[PDB]
Amino acid sequence: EHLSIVTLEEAPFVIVEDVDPLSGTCMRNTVPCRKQIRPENRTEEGGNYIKRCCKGFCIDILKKIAKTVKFTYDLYLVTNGKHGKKINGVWNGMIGEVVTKRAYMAVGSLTINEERSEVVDFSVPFIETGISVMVSRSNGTVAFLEPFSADVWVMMFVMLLIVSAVAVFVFESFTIGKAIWLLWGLVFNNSLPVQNPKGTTSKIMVSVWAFFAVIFLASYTANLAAFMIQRRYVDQVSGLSDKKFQRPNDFSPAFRFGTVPNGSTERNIRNNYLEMHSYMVKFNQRSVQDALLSLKSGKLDAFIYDAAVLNYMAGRDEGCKLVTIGSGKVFATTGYGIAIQKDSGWKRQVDLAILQLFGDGEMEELEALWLTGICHNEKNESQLDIDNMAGVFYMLAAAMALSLITFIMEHLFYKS
């Protein structure tokens, strides 16, 4: 039961790797899969077909299904690139090859729409996918010094000095220097080892400074709790707020939405919003990586794309600047499915195989091994980060090395 299957290449659903030239054959997960090039060639103007090894998620589904229903397979790739678009009544791509009978089954990154469901049949959904938009947010947030203002330094130091200068003389075995270290120590939440004054008048002014201590302390406690109690939020409007699919302008100078021309998402946006069809056809992209670079280099505000492929990408992003608008919003709600022959086919038993892969929990194990991303794998990652402590320690350590500069300057002035 040699069953030839046609597929397209889109990671991580179908990873294509050249055969190991030392082993000749394919190693580990990968199953043999050919690929033929019309434009250039070695012999017979293209007659030679290159050999490759195909491994991945959907490829593991096709090989595992091939082990469960006992149907053998010689995998084959598509020459004309497409997903499920049909032009002038003629379909091309994976669903096009499914309608052209060149493949009994078609497993890959093929979306299930009504136009394909009318001419070919599909199986049970494997992964939930639809139309979605992706945009990047800058990690521009910025720290404990932020609480107190710049008036803290000039005002506080000035008042201290003036008060120890004035207050010391309102204060008027041994006498040890000036008690300004006692005042500044009192400002930093008591913890003052200095000896207080023995006079009667100094018992008043110091008390006043104590006020100026605690209040300042309170400010250093209030305002450090003020700027730090404003985080973890997003206020971009939901529910098609940009209206760019119908009215491209918005509260922003421009909204750019690109679709893959002659694709399922473009045809679905072409049949949904005709304004999105005109502006999407004018802003039609080449590949997915070009649109991703357009979203990373500020060349595109957003993109309109398959949802699952963008959902696995969140893990992929490093420093996770990128994210999926809506915290996981899905618009179309359709699913992936292996194509079968119309009307007639093994469809029922194959569907039993798919839902059996779901019943054994292989979708959870595959999502944990493949889908799961170091990023967001942890539940959500309230706790003071290292950035704030870096902000404080930059000033504490800066005052430490600057204190050593006060020691070297104290030596330059001490040698005189």
Partner: protein
Amino acid sequence: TRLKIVTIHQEPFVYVRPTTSDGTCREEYTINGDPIKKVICNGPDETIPGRPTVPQCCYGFCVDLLIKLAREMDFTYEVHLVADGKFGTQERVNNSNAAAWNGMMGELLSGQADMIVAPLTINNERAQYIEFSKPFKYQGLTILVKKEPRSTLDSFMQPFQSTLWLLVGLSVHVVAVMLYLLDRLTLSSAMWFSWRVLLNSGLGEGAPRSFSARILGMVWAGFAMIIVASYTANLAAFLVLRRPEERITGINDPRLRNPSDKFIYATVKQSSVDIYFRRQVELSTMYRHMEKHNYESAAEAIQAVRDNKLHAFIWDSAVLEFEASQKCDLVTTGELFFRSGFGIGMRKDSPWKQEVSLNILKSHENGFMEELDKTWVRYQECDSRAPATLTFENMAGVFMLVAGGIVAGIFL
């Protein structure tokens, strides 16, 4: 012609309430400002213990989808509630050589029904007898519970991560050692100076007079006010809008795997969620705890989880998240697992399956399911909080960290 429609009372999708004294359904308008569409349902009124059939008024998401499908194809319908009140299961009660189905499945196989328009989940065990369309609801499995308290741990290391506290100590010895070096028994005076400055012990033991050492100690005391202001800052921030507890087990959690009689997680009896833990031999142990503590109706489990009777409740993500958005005393489990989909069910030889399913594929393409969502899944906000009295357990936690440090200090 005229075909029968079987449905079950599911809170967000199929409301089943009786009519007024006249006999017609009470006309109302939703919060959106639209007339809620209702139809006639002839089923067992649970109000009468008798289990007698009585026609009623039914309305909801699946009702709007049933009217929509009745508009797509040129057919009429006659809706009626399921007789036994359960979803359905396959069993052989009185015949040891012949088996049958019960629930809406039984009425469908016995010819008593022609179509099921309820939140019916697709799976392989049911796919052997009926044919399903493209799913109209994407959902999963989440453990649903009603969760209580601010502190589960000592409050000194909660606001500042381990790197921040360890950094604070590294600055304690950087200012104690840098103060011992800049001011050049003595080691105990440096450690007692830095520690007494960070903790406000106020011993007054010793002090250096060097401007480098006084500036170092001033940066250490100010930095002490900033690190205690950060610990009290982020420690006061976790007072409102606190992060949820781990009671939400998720796909791979210890609470979902271990069957303890104190943390009651269970599934609805005579439903699929019992088969999820009954088939797997590994969960068989948990199945034991589920065999003796299972509930019949999902609403009873919802009230048990609201009355603090059932700890967790593994159920579909659509219904559990809906009840979490309606009754904020309950929350679903993170890491959604067992993602399935509610879809209509038909018999094999029916031609409708070709068109109707395609219609559903078209019904998603036009965005009508998005409007149905805007109508029948609306999240009612709640009290954003607050904790108030709930501060004893933490205070016993931090006091336990201090007393533990006193024990380890007694060992020293």
